[PDB]
Amino acid sequence: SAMDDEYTKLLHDGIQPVAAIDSNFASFTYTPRSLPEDDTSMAILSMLQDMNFINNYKIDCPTLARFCLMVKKGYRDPPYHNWMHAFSVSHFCYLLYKNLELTNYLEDIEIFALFISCMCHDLDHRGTNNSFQVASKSVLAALYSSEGSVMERHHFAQAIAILNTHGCNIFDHFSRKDYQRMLDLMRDIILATDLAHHLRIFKDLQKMAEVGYDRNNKQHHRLLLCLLMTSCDLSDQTKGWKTTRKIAELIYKEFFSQGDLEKAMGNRPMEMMDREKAYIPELQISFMEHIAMPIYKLLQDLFPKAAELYERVASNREHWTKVSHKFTIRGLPSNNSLDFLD
Ligand SMILES: Cc1cc([C@@H]2CN(C(=O)c3ccc(F)c(Br)c3)CC(F)(F)C2)n2ncnc2n1
Ligand SMILES: [Mg+2]
Ligand SMILES: [Zn+2]
Fold first, then answer.
1. Does the annotation flag 198 for ligand binding?
2. Residues with Cβ within 5 Å of ion ligand 3?
3. Number of domains into which the chain is organized
4. Where along the chain is the active site annotated?
C-alpha cells in the first residue's frame, strides 16, 4: 500500500521541474547523495523529462511511474550497492547529457538505454562480488557462472523481469526492432559494469581515443557506451573529498562484511575484503591510480569538457596520500589504554 500511495502521487501530482530539485542539480559539482531518498523517484522522472525521453519515446506516464518505483524496490540495502548508488549513477548520466553534448556521439536510443541501464545496473545486489557467488555456490552462480559476470547478468535479468511485470514495460509500444535494440543495449551496458570487462576492453578504448571517435563506426558507439557506463558507475570519485571519504567507508563496510563470510566458510578473502589486512589508504591509492584515474583520463581525451572530472579524481587520489599518516597510531589511543594490544 506504501508503493500504491507513492505511485498515486508520482502519477497525478505532476513532474517537478529539474531546477526545483536543486539550483546546481545539472552541475558536475552537485552531489546527488545529498538528495533525500524519498525525493529520488521524482528526480528520476524530472531528469527523464528534461532530457525529453518521455515525449520523444511517448512513454506512458502510469507505466513509467510504476517502472521507476519497481526499480527502486528492486535494490536491497547493503552499505554501497543500494538504490542511492543507482540513483547517483543515473544522475551522473544526466550530467553527461547536460554537459558533454552526447548527441554528437550517440544515437538518441543509445543515450536513453544508457540512462535506463544506469537505473537498473545493480538490481538486487547482495553486497558480494562475482567470485563470492562461485565460491559460495549461490543460485546466481548456478545460473550464470559458465558465462561470467554473474552479478551483472543477474542485474540485467532483474531489469527484464521488471519490464515483464504487468504495467511496467515502458517500451511495450516500441516497434519490434526498437524493442530488440533497447534490450540488447541494456544487456551490453549492464554487462559493461563488470570491471573485468572494462579492463579487457581498455586497450580498445585507448585505441579509439588515439585515432579519434568515428560516429559512423558502430564498434566506436559500443566502446563509448561502455566507457560512459563505467564513468557513471565510478562517478562518486569525481566529487569532493568528503563524498569520496564517505563512499570509501561504505565500500569497505560492504567488502569487510563479505570477507567475514568468506573466513566463516574457510576461505582466505581478497586483501581488500579482509578487515585484518586491508590498508585502506594504499588500497584507495591503487584503485584511483590503476582504475579510476585512467578511466577519467580517457573521458577527458574524448570530451575536453570532462577535464575537470579527471582533475577531481586526481586531487582525491593525492588527498589519500596526504591523510595516510593518520592511519598510524601516534602516542596513546584516546582512552589512554593499550588494551587493544591484547
Ligand atoms: C566509486 C567507487 C567504486 C568502488 C568499487 C570498485 N570495485 C572493485 O572491485 C575494486 C577494485 C579494485 C580495488 F582496489 C578496490 Br579498493 C575495489 C568494484 C565495486 F566494489 F563494485 C565498487 N570503489 N572501490 C574503492 N573506491 C571505490 N569507489
Ligand atoms: Mg555492479
Ligand atoms: Zn554500480
1. no
2. 122, 233
3. 1
4. 81 (proton donor)
